[PDB]
Design a protein around this ligand. Structure first.
Ligand SMILES: O=C(O)c1ccccc1O
Ligand SMILES: O=C(O)c1ccccc1O
Ligand SMILES: O=C(O)c1ccccc1O
Ligand SMILES: O=C(O)c1ccccc1O
Lengths: 138, 138
């Protein structure tokens, strides 16, 4: 692995891959799926967002989103309200319980990933990788 | 950005995000979508793969995959064959043309991303980021 020249793009891929695999593994015992968790974190950040805008942010099939949003409402984690800047549409936001669920999860997974991801590079120091990864964003 | 302590997980996220955004931007002028490209690269690597296995590898709604696979067949990029280790199922593989399309794209995007992603950290040296990113995989 350290004897092969793998281009950054693929490495970022492989690592994101791993990151998600760990995520699924951490949510495996909980009554919620990785996808449901992602949809909650995305609606949260935006406070209120349209399903279509949410559809664009997640890069997902609209059909699967609709069923997804309905499942989330059934779980009492999401609710729909009229869109002010419109009238033919709605917005979806988290219900109080949904918000709590999203925070219980966000905290736990965030505490297991950091460890697992940093489990062996710590010496080289997460701060350095983080530093260089920032130089890629602007 | 360099004055805020953003945890690795989110940074990897934000960066993968960026990476995909560039991808969409590079394929924007071509008659193909990022999702179609991903499905082609995934089938390729595996040589031959079942739709369900492909469904698992991509983490996508089966419904959107089915329509996706049909669209790809219409474009002449993918073809279905009987699954040997089964008999009630099929495998999907790329057609010769599909293979070429996947290579024309893989080469171009791979040549624009490397540059764009490395556009400003080059000094710090992509090799270092790549090194540390590897220490995260095992
Ligand atoms: O679930 C909805 O209310 C919805 C509304 C508009 C477009 C896509 C959707 O899933
Ligand atoms: O409806 C869901 O719970 C769901 C969960 C994971 C992926 C796609 C989905 O529609
Ligand atoms: O497209 C198919 O042939 C297919 C077959 C089995 C399961 C999901 C699928 O999309
Ligand atoms: O069928 C497609 O071309 C397609 C493209 C991007 C995302 C989902 C899809 O089904």
């Amino acid at each position: 692995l350290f004897n092969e020249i793998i281009p950054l793009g693929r490495l970022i891929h492989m690592v994101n891959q791993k990151k998600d695999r760990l995520l699924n593994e951490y949510l495996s015992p909980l009554d919620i799926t990785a996808a449901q968790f992602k949809v909650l974190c995305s609606i949260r950040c935006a406070a209120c967002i349209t399903p279509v805008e949410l559809k664009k942010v997640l890069s997902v099939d609209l059909g699967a989103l609709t069923r997804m949003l309905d499942r989330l409402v059934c779980k009492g984690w999401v609710e729909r309200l009229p869109n002010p800047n419109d009238k033919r549409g709605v917005l979806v936001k988290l219900t109080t319980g949904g918000a709590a669920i999203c925070e219980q999860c966000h905290q736990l997974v965030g505490q297991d990933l950091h460890q697992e991801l940093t489990k062996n590079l710590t010496a080289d120091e997460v701060a350095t990788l983080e530093y260089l990864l920032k130089k890629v964003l602007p």
